[model samples]
Target: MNPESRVIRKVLALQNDEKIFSGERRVLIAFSGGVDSVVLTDVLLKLKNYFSLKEVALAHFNHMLRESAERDEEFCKEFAKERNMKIFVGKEDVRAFAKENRMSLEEAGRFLRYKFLKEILESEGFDCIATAHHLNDLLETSLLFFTRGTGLDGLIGFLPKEEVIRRPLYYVKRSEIEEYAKFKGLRWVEDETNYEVSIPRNRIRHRVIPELKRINENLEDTFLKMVKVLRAEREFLEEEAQKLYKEVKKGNCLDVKKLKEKPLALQRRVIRKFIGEKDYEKVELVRSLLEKGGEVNLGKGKVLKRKERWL
Candidate 1:
């Protein structure tokens, strides 16, 4: 296929996969007024009839972190208005929320963004919420998790669909998206924060990934394969852990003595599942409770106690 036709083919093929992008869904695009977002909106509108799409509109969240956020919102409203599409805009105090929750600005902004999306989805009766995350976004996310040494603890790779969240452009490259948008004469706002090296994601995008890609141009594809394999393994292990949990769990707590009988892997996962703890923290909790009965405070008002048997 010709290069332009290639992107459309991919998008068209993606819509056929009911497990991921659904043509029947009342969908809401998580529009951020960026190049990827612009391309996705263009494709969705162009394919609206072919896909038999129920309904599609744009949604934007203003984090209020930068002055450009106002412009982004204006751009999104204008884009939607010009296209005669429905659009939703949300405003949140990200800086204040982040400081209050002891989270980084990025974490705070991301949390608010998702929160905004879910509210709009529920209120507007949208079944699917799609984002403009392309291959580069996924590649950056993979690298971020790898650098943080989480070891797939919470690294559930973005599937084509995750519940109500859909990523139709998951397999598309950044360059392809920009090319398509340019061809259609679609204009998008450039997020200035993307150039800020202080942010870890920007740093990875600008310096780390490029440096690594210098050694291997196919690094993104390679890492994506690794993520898929790990996702499968993670799913299997989670299912197994849940089985063991059901076996030992009594009411709200797991039987401590019964848990001790299981392998260390099961023990850690069971604890992690209940308390949402990392490997080391949960491991410590397991060892401490098994060795001698005591109570340890898990943050967020939840506490685990060893009372004869139940934990």
Candidate 2:
């Protein structure tokens, strides 16, 4: 196959997957006005006949990070407008947010960006949020997780469908995205802050994976294969865990005595799995509860307890 044809076709294949959505889903893209987002938006539009999309909206959040963030926002508006689609622009002072929340700018930016996306999903009635999460993104994510000294806690984590998010570009690569976008004349703005040390993802994108790839030419391909295997393992373990969770007990907390009876490995496994199922990003918090003896509150005001009652 021709390289450009293969690239576009790979994206279209993922888009046409039945699991991507049902009939006429109101799809929204995280249109950052960047290469990946631009390429994804372009592909989704070009392959419009594959899925019956009710409506398509471009959701762009202006982090106000750089002086040119306004330009990015303008570019998103023009891009979406050209397609006669709705564009939702959200603005936030990311530096202030990071300072106020005692978090990194990257962390605050990500949190606020998704928060904005969810707000649009609700207010604008979007059924699904599409992202440009490609093979490279998945590779970087796996490498970052391993660097953090975190195992999947016996569950392989990355997948095509993770909670509300779906990666239709799971098999596509960043290089392909660039090539396709250039061929299609998809315009995008590259932010300079992408090179900064503040963003952990940028570090992975620029430094970590490239260094690792030199040692393994098929690293990206291998990483993707692992996502499939891990996704299967994750599904199997969750099915078994849910069945067992029924007999144990159900509260805002767990029955630790019963948990202890199941052996330490099973106990930790269940704990990590429970947290993983509920909130996929709290592996460290789960570890803190298991090892360092601390209480952590998940969403919806539900607190995981280790006190006399649950423990």
Candidate 3:
């Protein structure tokens, strides 16, 4: 493919994958007016006709972090205005929320943004929200899980479709974006806070990833391929789990001898699945209590015990 045509082909191929592209009506993009988001917006706008997109909404939350928050909002507003897309710009004192909740500003911002997005869905009734989360973000998140110590679920990285949200650029590489943006002469805003290497993500994105690239040029490509394989494996394992779960002898208290019949791995898997149904999000707390081998209440008509059945 010629240099110019390649970009066109790539875009079309992506559009083809999304079966709902035809008459999408409206797409809500969580745009930041940054290089990545700008590039994503340009491509989506170009293909809007193919999707029969009646409208595009730009959802932006100005977490009052730096002095340039308002400026960034203006840039985002102007861009969306130029495209005639509806723009939702919200401003919140993230610092205040963080201090009051005793949580990091990152957690505060994410929760608030999601809360606002949920509100938008309820009030405005948009089709779906599209994000500009690229392969680099997933790779960094995967690496973070490794460092933080995680389980099989965390290794899966971000799914292409998470509920009503979608990430079109999940398959796209970081290098490809930078190269494309340069070729297209795309403009974007820069957040000075991103350059601060003290942050865990920034450190990984800059220092750790660069060094990894030196060790293996195809590291990202390899990792991306493995994600597909892991998904398949996990799917099969989950199916197997259901068969075992159905046969489990659940009485007033689980019989330790009965539980011992299944493999240790399968037992843990079934237990995890049970906990998930109870909507127990705190894995560490559950793990500690389970290891203690006593009557442990797991919220909502469930108790975990080591010996005979837990009521």
Candidate 4:
């Protein structure tokens, strides 16, 4: 089969099994005029009839960070126009937002972009937002979480079908996306900042991943398998923790004696949920309250105390 056909078939098969597009009739594609988003738009357009899609629109957020930001927005608008799809464009001052919020530029951009997309989704009646995060992006994110000392949830990466965000290219490789784009004569804008090593993600993408690929050619596939295993374990633990939380929780307080009887893992999970904090040390301190029957100051003047058997 041809490269385009191969990619389309594989994606369709994955959708058939996972049902990622099952109930989504109207989708808003997070268009950036990049290779990934362009390929995603094309693939979804081709599969529109198969999925019984009512409408497919583009949502473009211009961070206004680069010299070519307007050009990229125009490209996205022109693409949407050519395809006869509805498009929404938003602009934000990412640098100003970052400074005000004490967040990195990358973090600020993501926050504003998602806020825009979600606003469009709610106002325009779109079922969900579709992104173009491929397998390589997933692997990179998992490695980032691992290096940054993350919990199991971070290492498991993202779900293909999130509550309002859908990743249709979750299983597709970057090479496959490039090949498909080339075969289809697709034109996309190049973001020069992507090559800069100042960003941790860029460094991992350009350096760490290449060396890892040398060690194992099928790294993405291996990582996906590992993620599936971890996700399953996380789901089981989360379910058990919820049950334990219900058992001990009583209207803003917890039955400390009952919680102490559960396993340490469940205890930590319940305490984290009850206290609304996930810090390892904070949870441990709260656990100590169960035995000592005293107060530990949770940040921001909130205090967790144990009186008798109630916490």
Candidate 5:
């Protein structure tokens, strides 16, 4: 099989199995003018007719953190124009946002970028947003979570289809993506900061991943197998939690006595879901209120109060 065809087949297989592109007419690609996004854009365009896609557009969020930020934005605009596809461009002062919110530069960039993509998806009436996160990214994320102390959910990493977000290239490797881009003669801009080892992700990407790969050449494939297994387990737990949540939920309040009677895992999951918080600390704090009736102050003037037997 040809190299390009092989990559496309992998993407199609994942889509068919997961239905990542199912029930969607219009999709907004989160373009970053990098190899991953450029390959994603091209692959999606090639499969547009096959998927019965009515429209596909690119949404580029310029973080404006680097010297070539404007250049990358221009490249994206031109890339879309050459392909005769619609494009939406958004810009943000990421440094200012990082300082104001006391967040890292990467964190701020991600927040703003998703904000722009979601806005475009809603305002433009797009079905879902497609990102270019690939298998290598999944491995990196899982490793990061492992290093940072994560629970089952974090270890599972991300999903191919997450509500309004879609990752069509979830199974494709970075090497395959670069090969496809080269075979198709695609042009993409580089982010120099990606090579910087100071960032934890970059360090993992350049140092840890390669060393691990040397030990196990099929690390990515092995990781994918683990991810599938973990995902299934996570889904089962989530479904069980949903059932427990329904049993204890009463209007906006939860039946504290019933919640207390449930297992600790279920209790934590129910509290996390009820409070809409992913933090373990916050969930634990909220759970404490069941024993002692009191209000737990959730930041930003939000409070979780335990009144009588309801929370």
Candidate 6:
């Protein structure tokens, strides 16, 4: 199949399976002038009315990291203008923010970008925010999580629709997206930082994934299937954990006596749910108190107080 036909079929299948635009009249695409997002924006615009879409717009955030940040923003503005789509533009000093907050540049960029996207989505009353995270992006995230000691939730990679975020391009491949753009003669801004090996994601995308793909050319397809299985299993585990949460939870306290009786996995998940955190270290620290009653301070005003069987 041609690239365009394949993408169209993939997107149509996604719409049927995931209901990407079901009950959504308004959506904002998180465009960065990247090929993946440009293709996504083009596809979604074409299918807007078909999926009952009433409003669609572009949301671009200039992280102010590279010298071409402003140029990228201008490119996006013109892209949106040519398409006659409403656009939301935002600016943030990611470098200073990263330095002040002691976070990596990539982390700061993502934090500010998503924060701005959410603000625009909510304030503008957009039904959801769509991102152009394709199969490769999900694979990179899964590999990163694997290296970081993440639980099943992280291992499942990105979801098609999660809360207010939608990833319609989840099932598509990076190569396919590029091919679609090429076939359609789409132009995009190239972020040179993508080649920077110092960034962990960049290293994985450039150095790791390609080498891994040499061993198994179908790595992405295999990982996608794995992610589907993991997602289903993870959802089941999360549901059980929610039940356990109610069983052991009581008015801002956890009944350590009841918690100790459940399986260790359930105990860990229940504690994580109660704390609203998935930080492995913090969760493990709090889980330790299941055996011995103690008190420790966790982040964000959540304290682990193990006293007389109540936590």
**TM-scores for every predicted model:** 0.77, 0.77, 0.79, 0.86, 0.82, 0.84
Clashes, model 1 = 0
Answer with 1 or 6, whichever has the higher lDDT. 6
RMSD of each: 4.2, 5.6, 4.6, 3.1, 3.9, 3.6
If the candidates were sorted by their lDDT against the true structure, best first, what order would they fall in?
5, 6, 4, 1, 3, 2
lDDT of 1 by residue, 93-125 (tens): 888998999988777777788888999999989
Ranking by TM-score: 4, 6, 5, 3, 1, 2
Clashes of each: 0, 0, 6, 0, 0, 0
lDDT comparison, 2 vs 5, better candidate? 5
Query: Which digits, one per residue and each the tens of the lDDT, describe model 5 over residues 1-311?
Result: 87699789988899778778777999999888888888998899899988889999999888877888888888889998998999999988888998999988877878888898999999999999988888998999899999997899989778898999999888888889998988889878974225222388888988999999999999988988998899889988899999999888878778887788788888898888887867878888878877755666765222334432332
Q: Which ten residues in a row have the lowest lDDT in candidate 5?
A: 300-309
lDDT of each: 0.75, 0.69, 0.70, 0.83, 0.84, 0.83
lDDT of 6 by residue, 254-292 (tens): 888778889988989988887777788888887877786
Regions of candidate 4 where Cα sits further than 4 Å from its true position: 96-103, 191-198, 291-293, 300-311
Better of 2 and 6 by lDDT: 6
| lDDT per residue (tens digit) for residues 75-132 in model 4 | 8889999989999999988889989999888778888888999999999899999998
**Model 4, CA-based lDDT:** 0.83
Question: How many clashes in candidate 2?
Answer: 0
Better by TM-score, candidate 6 or 5: 6
Model 2 Cα displacement at 153 (Å)? 6.1
Off by over 4 Å in 5: 100-102, 192-198, 251-267, 274-311
What are the runs in model 1 whose C-alpha is more than 4 Å off?
Answer: 8-18, 21-24, 47-52, 62-74, 90-115, 155-160, 192-198, 255-264, 287-311
Which whole-number lDDT from 0 to 100 does residue 220 have in model 5?
A: 87
* Top-scoring candidate (TM-score): 4
